[PDB]
């Protein structure tokens, strides 16, 4: 929970945080690498992704 709150900050400030999304011409929304977690981790990173492209531009 809170680590994902901290993780979106470093991408808001710039380039990626706790894990490494990098792949700016290959986007996979973020890396989390977890499948036993809920599938709403797959969509909260979709809102995380449409802001970092507008930050690097």
């Amino acid at each position: 929970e809170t680590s994902l709150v901290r993780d979106l900050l470093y991408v808001f400030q710039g380039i990626d945080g706790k894990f490494v999304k990098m792949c700016n011409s290959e986007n996979c929304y973020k890396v989390d690498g977890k499948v036993a977690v809920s599938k709403s981790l797959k969509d909260i990173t979709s809102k995380l992704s449409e802001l970092g492209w507008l930050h690097n531009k």
Binding site: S3, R6, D7, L9, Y10, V11, F12, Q13, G14, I15, D16, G17, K18, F19, V20
Partner: protein, 225 residues
């Protein structure tokens, strides 16, 4: 991570002041005033890149403030010395915001992002000051030759209002010495040269012969006048 981000906020805060921090080491390899900044490896490589683009800001703070103290120490009467005084009092406004958010550091919750917003205006202030300083190292001008270079920067830095306002003020702070040396030559004819600020040198002879070394903010027509 969020405790690791806040100490990279505090270690960067000392980098912007000009002193060398703990996790970010500063080293000049070049004769230019800009020193290199190396961040150490972190437990998360993301923030290490995010702090890495805020290191070009103290690159620009270390650029112009070493220039204005080298200009001040190797003592001149020149307009390049009075140029450095207009840059020094702007450094008072830069150092006073950093101390005000440190009152919020005892209540410490400030971000890598709330700090990132305030540094993009103050990279703007420092990058223009660095790019004036970088032009002055390549130039080696003084007197009216500096006055015409600063008059050209009032032309180019238009479109950004606040980059125009300092480039105006730097020109106005370089001309109020120079046109006072003009006026002190008009009321008596007192030609004093600490390092030949004014163009006209003392010669029966009638040999005041303006110089081609220097020119006022206007063209040679007002220098002949």
């Amino acid at each position: 991570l969020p405790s690791q981000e806040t100490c990279l906020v505090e270690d960067l805060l000392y980098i912007l002041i000009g002193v060398d921090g703990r996790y970010i080491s500063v080293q000049p390899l070049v004769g230019r005033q800009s020193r290199s900044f190396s961040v150490e490896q972190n437990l998360d490589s993301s923030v290490k890149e995010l702090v890495n683009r805020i290191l070009p800001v103290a690159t620009n703070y270390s650029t112009v403030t070493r220039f204005v103290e080298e200009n001040s120490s190797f003592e001149y009467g020149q307009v390049n010395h009075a140029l450095g005084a207009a840059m020094r009092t702007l450094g008072k406004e830069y150092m006073i915001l950093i101390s005000q958010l440190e009152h919020l550091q005892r209540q410490g919750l400030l971000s890598l992002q709330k700090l990132w917003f305030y540094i993009q205006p103050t990279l703007r202030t420092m990058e223009v000051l660095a790019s004036i300083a970088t032009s002055l190292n390549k130039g080696e001008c003084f007197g009216g030759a500096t006055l015409s270079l600063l008059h050209d920067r009032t032309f180019g830095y238009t479109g950004d209002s606040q980059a125009q306002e300092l480039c105006l003020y730097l020109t106005k702070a370089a001309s109020a010495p120079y046109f006072d040396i003009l006026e002190r030559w008009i009321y008596r004819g007192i030609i004093n040269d600490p390092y030949s600020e004014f163009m006209v040198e003392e010669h029966w002879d009638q040999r005041y012969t303006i110089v081609q070394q220097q020119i006022p903010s206007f063209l040679q027509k007002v220098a002949d006048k």
